[PDB]
Every structure is written in structure tokens, then in C-alpha cells.
Amino acid sequence: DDKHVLSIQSHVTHGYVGNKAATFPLQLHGFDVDAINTVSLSNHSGYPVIKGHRMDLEEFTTIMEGLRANDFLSDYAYVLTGYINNRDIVRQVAATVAEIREARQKQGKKDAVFFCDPVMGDDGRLYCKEEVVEAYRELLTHADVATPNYFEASILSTVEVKDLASAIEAANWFHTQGTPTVVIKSFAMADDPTHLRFLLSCRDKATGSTKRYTGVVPYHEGRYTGTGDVFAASLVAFAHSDPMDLAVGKAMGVLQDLIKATIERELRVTSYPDRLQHPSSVALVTPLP
Amino acid sequence: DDKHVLSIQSHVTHGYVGNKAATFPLQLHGFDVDAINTVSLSNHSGYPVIKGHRMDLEEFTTIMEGLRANDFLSDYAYVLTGYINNRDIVRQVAATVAEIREARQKQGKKDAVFFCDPVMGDDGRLYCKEEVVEAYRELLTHADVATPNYFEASILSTVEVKDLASAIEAANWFHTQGTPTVVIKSFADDPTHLRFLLSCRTGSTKRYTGVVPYHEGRYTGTGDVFAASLVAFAHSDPMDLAVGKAMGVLQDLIKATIERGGSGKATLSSRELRVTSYPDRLQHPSSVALVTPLP
Ligand SMILES: Nc1ncnc2c1ncn2[C@@H]1O[C@H](COP(=O)(O)OP(=O)(O)O)[C@@H](O)[C@H]1O
Numbered sequence: 001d002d003k004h005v006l007s008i009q010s011h012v013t014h015g016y017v018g019n020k021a022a023t024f025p026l027q028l029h030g031f032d033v034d035a036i037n038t039v040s041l042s043n044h045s046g047y048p049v050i051k052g053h054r055m056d057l058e059e060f061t062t063i064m065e066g067l068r069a070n071d072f073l074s075d076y077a078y079v080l081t082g083y084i085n086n087r088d089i090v091r092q093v094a095a096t097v098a099e100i101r102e103a104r105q106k107q108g109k110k111d112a113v114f115f116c117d118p119v120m121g122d123d124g125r126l127y128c129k130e131e132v133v134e135a136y137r138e139l140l141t142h143a144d145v146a147t148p149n150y151f152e153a154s155i156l157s158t159v160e161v162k163d164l165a166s167a168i169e170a171a172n173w174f175h176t177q178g179t180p181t182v183v184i185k186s187f188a189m190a191d192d193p194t195h196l197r198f199l200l201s202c203r204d205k206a207t208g209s210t211k212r213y214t215g216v217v218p219y220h221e222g223r224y225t226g227t228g229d230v231f232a233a234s235l236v237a238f239a240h241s242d243p244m245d246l247a248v249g250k251a252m253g254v255l256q257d258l259i260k261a262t263i264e265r266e267l268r269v270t271s272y273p274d275r276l277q278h279p280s281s282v283a284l285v286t287p288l289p
Numbered sequence: 290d291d292k293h294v295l296s297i298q299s300h301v302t303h304g305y306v307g308n309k310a311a312t313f314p315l316q317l318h319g320f321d322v323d324a325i326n327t328v329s330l331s332n333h334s335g336y337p338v339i340k341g342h343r344m345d346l347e348e349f350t351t352i353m354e355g356l357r358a359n360d361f362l363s364d365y366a367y368v369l370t371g372y373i374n375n376r377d378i379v380r381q382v383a384a385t386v387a388e389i390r391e392a393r394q395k396q397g398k399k400d401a402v403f404f405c406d407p408v409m410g411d412d413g414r415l416y417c418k419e420e421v422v423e424a425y426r427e428l429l430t431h432a433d434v435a436t437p438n439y440f441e442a443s444i445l446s447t448v449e450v451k452d453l454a455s456a457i458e459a460a461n462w463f464h465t466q467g468t469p470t471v472v473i474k475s476f477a478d479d480p481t482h483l484r485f486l487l488s489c490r491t492g493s494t495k496r497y498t499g500v501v502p503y504h505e506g507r508y509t510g511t512g513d514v515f516a517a518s519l520v521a522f523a524h525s526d527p528m529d530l531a532v533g534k535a536m537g538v539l540q541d542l543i544k545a546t547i548e549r550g551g552s553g554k555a556t557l558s559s560r561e562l563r564v565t566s567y568p569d570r571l572q573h574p575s576s577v578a579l580v581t582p583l584p
Pocket residue numbers: 122148149150184185186196198217218219220221222224225226227228229231251252255256259
């Protein structure tokens with residue numbers, strides 16, 4: 001099957017971020033999730049105490065050696081990258097994707113789709129050294145889809161994402177850098193305080209034309225962990241069989257069901273298995289003129 | 290709720306063994322799975338090449354310090370151990386389980402159940418040092434439930450498990466060792482069936498047996514899905530029914546693996562269990578194996 005994802009994200013023993021947020025949703029959708037755990041921690045970065053192991057570049061290339069030696073690299077119709085927070089591994093992902101593209105081409109399979117979630121910060125706070133930011137600018141030259149939060153889109157493009165106009169500028173930066181498809185997952189709007197806006201920006205490499213889509217979700221009170229990780233995983237799942245605009249709509253609806261369930265910080269991903277596959281409602285994703 | 294498991298097993302990128310095999314079924318049963326990954330490898334040990342990282346004791350005690358400091362230990366109504374292949378970590382599981390039981394007592398919670406799958410070898414081959422065998426003998430004195438394959442039962446007890454009689458002798462060894470509940474998951478007329486033993490030690494022992502169809506071919510991760518399913522069903526079933534349902538889950542999963550190309554003659558990759566293929570069959574097997582009292 002083509003429902004095979006290499007997922008390069010965090011592992012935590014307790015809670016739902018990185019591969020712990022992404023794996024269950026994708027498996028529910030019928031995907032084999034092949035996870036490389038960039039860290040193996042007790043819990044996410046928000047608890048009072050974080051303990052555990054972080055991969056270095058040598059651990060990453062050792063795992064790749066095993067995948068290469070057993071000829072698994074052509075399995076990966078999708079590559080999903082999340083929390084890495086290591087300059088050398090962010091840079092190495094480009095080689096991993098190129099070796100997957102080569103193995104699939106040699107076996108005459110559909111091109112791999114590389115989804116790059118450039119995980120660096122949230123709520124004004126940066127998790128990574130500045131060298132990681134530039135590593136993501138170079139890696140995004142190779143991505144098919146990028147799913148930055150507004151903070152990541154802002155620091156990568158140097159455009160303050162604060163409304164639809166500035167979101168479009170930040171997205172255009174991603175296109176110029178070489179990412180054809182961008183989802184800016186949410187930004188607040190001074191002029192519409194009860195909603196979050198998202199942008200889907202689709203550059204046609206051949207024509208140079210850009211198809212843009214936007215929509216909103218309700219702006220729920222409170223801070224949530226893992227929202228991006230569930231979002232990107234859900235997007236991969238829906239984008240497998242849906243056009244990207246509809247795939248974004250479903251993925252938004254999945255997050256809205258999860259957040260509203262939490263309300264009636266931690267996303268209880270495994271409590272809502274039917275909502276993960278069939279969200280109680282889809283967000284409208286409408287073309288822009 | 291008490292549907293929280295601390296699961297101490299292997300992580301593989303490719304394929305379905307250890308925590309990757311155990312996690313999805315337990316999550317489908319509504320459990321939070323807190324996984325400690327004893328190794329993070331490219332694939333299971335059956336492949337010609339196996340690459341990646343292995344925990345030492347210090348890495349294990351480091352994660353444990355995180356779980357302790359954040360007051361997570363009292364949440365673990367269940368402890369499930371599988372692939373460790375490290376004498377010092379196997380030894381350390383007794384102290385981990387003891388600390389969970391004390392944190393649970395302190396908070397007015399019912400006692401935990403520790404399920405010990407003593408993962409050491411299969412098809413007559415050890416995949417661990419002789420050191421790990423003895424560490425399992427000593428951990429098993431602290432286990433509530435043990436789920437050896439017939440090889441593991443054989444080397445732990447030093448009884449050759451080849452029939453119902455010898456399986457009973459091996460299970461008796463586990464009970465004398467201190468393990469009240471033993472499932473010997475399969476053994477050898479009638480070449481088309483495998484037999485299993487459930488033995489529950491008041492000094493008296495209740496024993497049960499049953500059969501499943503024997504599918505030709507070598508599967509890996511079968512024990513890992515089985516123990517995971519046993520934990521899920523045993524939470525709301527008596528142990529005989531929970532074994533019956535876990536056996537049914539495995540028959541469905543092996544049939545789906547064969548259905549999607551996983552013949553006896555097929556590749557290691559083709560024989561990888563189709564864990565994602567039929568999620569409803571992981572919760573609700575199409576058959577439930579009979580588990581019938583012995584006299
Ligand atoms: N407070 C919120 N109210 C509504 N939806 C939210 C909220 N926070 C997150 N989301 C949803 O989940 C996704 C959250 O990811 P976002 O915060 O944009 O990314 P990240 O978690 O990577 O920072 C959004 O696209 C949106 O659907």
C-alpha cells in the first residue's frame with residue numbers, strides 16, 4: 001500500500017505531543033506509521049520536569065543505515081517531520097527525503113510527499129537555537145507541504161503574520177524558498193477577536209500561479225499542547241484521498257472536535273476515535289480572488 | 290479511570306513488535322499507554338540488519354525520575370513489560386513496580402497488576418545473554434501475570450514444554466517462583482492446532498486449556514499483541530475469558546496478515562502483522578477461543 005508514513009517527531013512516555021499525537025490518528029486512517037523518535041522524554045516541555053534521551057546525528061544516520069540495508073526506503077509514500085530541535089538532523093532530513101525519492105523513482109512508484117512541520121516555538125517562545133531556524137529555511141527548499149504555526153511562519157519569512165495580507169506574504173516567502181503548498185494553521189485577528197484564520201497557499205511550479213484559500217475556526221480560550229501535531233497527521237490522512245482544500249477542512253474539524261471535547265491543555269487523542277476519522281463538522285475552506 | 294498502562298518494551302521504526310504492536314490495540318480499548326522504549330531500532334531482530342539505540346540502566350532511571358517528579362506513578366493501574374534484553378533494567382522493574390504500588394496505596398487506589406512477558410527467544414533460539422534468563426526468574430517472583438512462549442517457559446523452569454503435561458510442570462515452577470497467573474501461549478499429536486495453558490495458583494491451582502488453528506509460517510510480534518490484548522480484556526473479564534478473547538484477536542490478525550500476502554513462504558516484511566488493517570477485530574474478534582477447565 002501507499003499508506004506508509006516515515007514520521008520523524010518526538011516520543012514522550014506521558015501525554016500527547018509529536019509521535020504520541022500523530023501515530024494513533026494516522027493508524028485509525030489505515031496508515032503504517034514508521035516513527036523515528038528524535039527525543040524519548042518522560043513528558044512534553046510544559047511540565048515542571050523533563051527527563052530523557054535526545055538523538056544526535058549519529059543515532060539518526062544509524063537508524064537510516066538499518067532502513068537502507070533492509071530496502072524499506074521505497075515504502076514511504078509520505079514523510080512527516082515534526083519536533084527535531086537539532087540543526088544537524090534538520091539538515092540530514094533533506095538527504096533522507098532525497099534517498100526516499102530516489103528509491104521510489106527507481107521502483108517506479110508515485111513521488112513521495114514530504115510534509116515539513118517546522119517545529120520551533122509557540123506562544124512567542126522559541127524552543128531551538130537560531131541555527132535550527134536557518135536549518136529549516138534550507139530544508140523547506142525540499143518540502144512538498146509546510147504546516148508552520150504563525151510564529152514559525154513569522155520567524156522563517158521575517159513577516160509578522162497578524163492578518164490575511166501578512167499570512168499571504170509569509171506563504172509567498174515559503175513558495176519562493178521552494179515549498180509549493182503551505183498551511184498557516186491559525187492566526188488571531190485584531191479586527192475579529194472570536195475567530196482564528198488559517199491560510200492554504202498552493203503555488204503551481206509550471207504556471208507560477210498561486211491558488212489561495214482561507215477560512216476560520218472559533219477562537220477557544222486556553223492554551224493547548226499537540227494541536228499542530230494532531231493537525232499535520234490528520235492533514236496527511238485526508239490529503240491522501242481529498243483535494244488539499246477539503247483535506248484542510250476535515251483536519252480543522254478534527255481539531256475543533258478535540259478542543260471542544262477537552263473543554264466539556266492535554267489533547268485526549270485516543271478518547272475520540274470516530275471524531276478523528278469523521279469530524280462532527282468540516283471548516284469551510286474557500287478560494288480567494 | 291484506571292485505564293493507564295506503563296508499557297516497557299522495544300520501539301521499531303519498521304514493522305510491528307513491542308510497544309508498536311502493543312500500543313494501538315490498548316489505545317483502541319480506551320487505555321492511555323505510557324511507553325518506555327527499551328530500544329529504538331530500525332526493525333525487529335529477525336531481519337539480516339538491525340540498527341539503532343539501546344537504553345542502559347541510567348537512561349531507564351532517568352525516565353523514571355521524570356515520571357516520579359511529575360507524580361505520574363500512581364496513575365499506573367497496569368504495568369506491562371516485554372522486550373528489555375538488559376539484565377540491569379529487567380532487575381530494576383521490581384523496584385519500579387514496588388514504587389508504583391506504594392504511590393497507589395498512598396493515594397487510596399486499588400493495587401496495580403504487573404504483566405511480565407519474559408521476552409528472551411523463540412523457535413529454539415535465545416535473543417538475550419544467559420544473564421537476562423536469571424534476572425527474569427527473579428523478576429517473575431514479583432509478577433502478577435506472566436505470558437511466556439513455550440521456549441521461555443522451558444528455559445526459565447528447565448522443563449522441556451512439548452505437551453500439556455510438561456506445560457503444567459513448567460507453570461507449576463512459575464507458581465512456586467511466586468507468579469500466581471501463567472499463560473503458556475502455545476505448544477504442540479495434532480499438527481493443525483496449537484494448545485495453550487492458563488494456570489492460576491489457598492495453595493490450590495485452577496488450570497485451563499484450549500486450542501487455536503496452527504497457521505504455517507513464522508510471525509513476530511504475536512506475543513506482544515497477545516499480552517497487550519490480555520491486559521485490555523483482563524481489565525473487564527475473568528482471566529479465562531480474557532485469554533479466549535486475546536487468542537481470537539491473534540487468529541483474526543494472523544488471518545488478515547496471510548490475507549494481505551503474509552504466507553509461510555512470504556518475506557519478513559509481508560509477514561509483519563497487519564496491526565492497522567482491522568481495528569474493530571482488535572476490539573471485537575470474529576471468534577473467541579474456548580478456555581475449558583481441566584480436572
Ligand atoms: N485556541 C484555539 N481555538 C481553536 N482552534 C485552535 C486553538 N488552538 C489550536 N487550534 C486548532 O488546532 C490547530 C492548532 O495548531 P496551531 O496552534 O495553529 O499550531 P501549533 O499547535 O503547531 O502551534 C489550528 O489549525 C486550529 O484548528
